[PDB]
């Protein structure tokens, strides 16, 4: 009885054929740099987990970004550091330049390469059909890379993707929620922002994998091409599932939970209803027609699936006709 187990269909074995030192983040010894090499210039902002500053590395006069971590479990801090070090040099992965102890917070401060990012609210309004495909391809390079390195990002969304549009430079940042994929491991479902949450998280299916990032990628794509921000606009985690079911339909949702022997929360009884799966051309109108194409719709169809096992992997997504027009 209970949930039917699941494994990723790709990169299942990456972490077992690597030394324990690679994925065992708890045993990692942090090599501390010197906080005096960095001078804070301006606060970019503060979120739930960190305060971020633009800074200058006074040893080479280069612009950097300093992420001062708020106190959390020491395990969560070493996980971020180990993943960043393991992924360093990878295509479109942010470079971790240093780790210092901030004198004021008494917490680790991660120093990154600076990316001159255009805010989401501005790029969202100007990206062309061509630019969207180009940037989606750059994201897929980062995701196939971290997945092939046995890591799932788990927080893919626009504010975690830096774009320097003038230089067509993209970097996938914020590896604070990222984890090592271990076949059969039960993970915490309290990851990602509500609108980006995969069905596996919303139905409390813990044995998820890299394919969670493909759902989030699909949510970003739908919002962009259809001009509907966010695409699945739930008022809460339960309504989030209802919003998805109104597009993907209730019959495939029941096939998904029956395949994995998942039981819906009984509060879905008063709110879920019965919904047909909708054709993607329904979301097309005269204000988004220039961002949509049969290739974009077919690609979206293959990412936004309830069954995490049925979604395109990052490598398959890169082979899709949607990217044929992108100069490679
Ligand atoms: N390398 C960077 N270049 C430019 N801006 C950055 C960089 N790293 C972070 N930022 C900015 O700071 C914000 C917070 O960074 P992030 O790593 O996502 O922290 P958190 O885990 O607290 O969300 C980002 O959304 C972005 O606006
Ligand atoms: N201005 C530098 C700084 C000082 C204190 C904290 C801090 C430290 C502990 C708890 C919460 C916090 O905001 C942080 Cl993250 C940064
Ligand atoms: N933080 C800047 C940013 C990152 C990704 C995208 C993006 C790019 C391609 C497709 C969907 C997207 O949301 C945009 Cl519009 C802006
Ligand atoms: Mg972030
Ligand atoms: Mg984060």
UniProtKB/Swiss-Prot annotation:
Q: Where in the cell is it found?
A: Nucleus
EC annotation? 2.7.11.1
Record entry for activity regulation: Constitutively active protein kinase whose activity is not directly affected by phosphorylation. Seems to be regulated by level of expression and localization.
Q: Which residues form the Protein kinase domain?
A: 38-323
Q: Any extra detail in the entry?
A: Can use both ATP and GTP as phosphoryl donors. Phosphorylation by casein kinase 2 has been estimated to represent up to one quarter of the eukaryotic phosphoproteome. Casein kinase 2 has been found to be increased at protein level and up-regulated at the level of enzyme activity in the majority of cancers. However, elevated levels of casein kinase 2 are present in certain normal organs such as brain and testes.
Phylogenetic placement of the source organism: Eukaryota, Metazoa, Chordata, Craniata, Vertebrata
Family that this chain belongs to: Belongs to the protein kinase superfamily. Ser/Thr protein kinase family. CK2 subfamily.
Keywords for this entry?
Answer: Apoptosis, ATP-binding, Biological rhythms, Cell cycle, Disease variant, Intellectual disability, Kinase, Nucleotide-binding, Nucleus, Phosphoprotein, Serine/threonine-protein kinase, Transcription, Transcription regulation, Transferase, Wnt signaling pathway
Q: Which sites are catalytic?
A: 155 (proton acceptor)
What does the record give as the function of this protein?
Catalytic subunit of a constitutively active serine/threonine-protein kinase complex that phosphorylates a large number of substrates containing acidic residues C-terminal to the phosphorylated serine or threonine. Regulates numerous cellular processes, such as cell cycle progression, apoptosis and transcription, as well as viral infection. May act as a regulatory node which integrates and coordinates numerous signals leading to an appropriate cellular response.
Q: Which gene encodes it?
A: CSNK2A1
Expression by tissue, per the entry, reads: Expressed in gastric carcinoma tissue and the expression gradually increases with the progression of the carcinoma (at protein level).
For biological process, the GO terms are: apoptotic process; chaperone-mediated protein folding; DNA damage response; double-strand break repair; negative regulation of apoptotic signaling pathway; negative regulation of double-strand break repair via homologous recombination; negative regulation of proteasomal ubiquitin-dependent protein catabolic process; negative regulation of signal transduction by p53 class mediator
Query: What is the protein's quaternary organization?
Result: Heterotetramer composed of two catalytic subunits (alpha chain and/or alpha' chain) and two regulatory subunits (beta chains). The tetramer can exist as a combination of 2 alpha/2 beta, 2 alpha'/2 beta or 1 alpha/1 alpha'/2 beta subunits. Also part of a CK2-SPT16-SSRP1 complex composed of SSRP1, SUPT16H, CSNK2A1, CSNK2A2 and CSNK2B, which forms following UV irradiation. Interacts with RNPS1. Interacts with SNAI1. Interacts with PML (isoform PML-12). Interacts with CCAR2. Interacts with HIRIP3.
Complete protein: which residues are present? 2 to 329 of 391
Cellular component GO terms, alphabetically?
A: cytosol; nucleoplasm; nucleus; plasma membrane; PML body; protein kinase CK2 complex; Sin3-type complex
- Name of the featured protein: Casein kinase II subunit alpha
């Amino acid at each position: 009885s209970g949930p039917v187990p699941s494994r990723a269909r790709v990169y299942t074995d990456v972490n077992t054929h690597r030394p324990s030192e690679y994925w065992d983040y708890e045993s990692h010894v942090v090599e501390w740099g010197n906080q005096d090499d960095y001078q804070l210039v301006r606060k970019l902002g503060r979120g739930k987990y960190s305060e971020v500053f633009e800074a200058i590395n006074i040893t080479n006069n280069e612009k950097v970004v300093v992420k001062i971590l708020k106190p959390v479990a020491a395990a969560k801090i070493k996980r971020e550091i180990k993943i960043l070090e393991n992924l360093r040099g990878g295509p479109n992965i942010i470079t971790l330049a240093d780790i210092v102890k901030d004198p004021v917070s008494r917490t680790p401060a991660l120093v990154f390469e600076h990316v001159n990012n255009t805010d989401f609210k501005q790029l969202y309004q100007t990206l062309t059909d061509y630019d969207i495909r180009f940037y989606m391809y750059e994201i897929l390079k980062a995701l196939d890379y971290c997945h092939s390195m046995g890591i799932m990002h788990r927080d893919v969304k626009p504010h975690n993707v830096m774009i320097d549009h003038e230089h067509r430079k993209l970097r996938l940042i914020d590896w604070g929620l990222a984890e090592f994929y271990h076949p059969g491991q039960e993970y915490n479902v309290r990851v990602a922002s509500r609108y980006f949450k995969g069905p596996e998280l919303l139905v409390d299916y813990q044995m998820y994998d890299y394919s969670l990032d493909m759902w989030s990628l699909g949510c970003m794509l739908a919002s962009m091409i259809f001009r509907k921000e966010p695409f699945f606009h739930g008022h809460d985690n339960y309504d989030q599932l209802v919003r998805i079911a109104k597009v993907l339909g209730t019959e495939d949702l029941y096939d998904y939970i029956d395949k994995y022997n998942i039981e819906l929360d009984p509060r879905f009884n008063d709110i879920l209803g019965r919904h047909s799966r909708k054709r993607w051309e329904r979301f097309v109108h005269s204000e988004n027609q220039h961002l949509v194409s049969p290739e974009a719709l077919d690609f979206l169809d293959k990412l936004l699936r309830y069954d995490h096992q049925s979604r395109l992997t990052a490598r398959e997504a890169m082979e899709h006709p949607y990217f044929y027009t992108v100069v490679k």
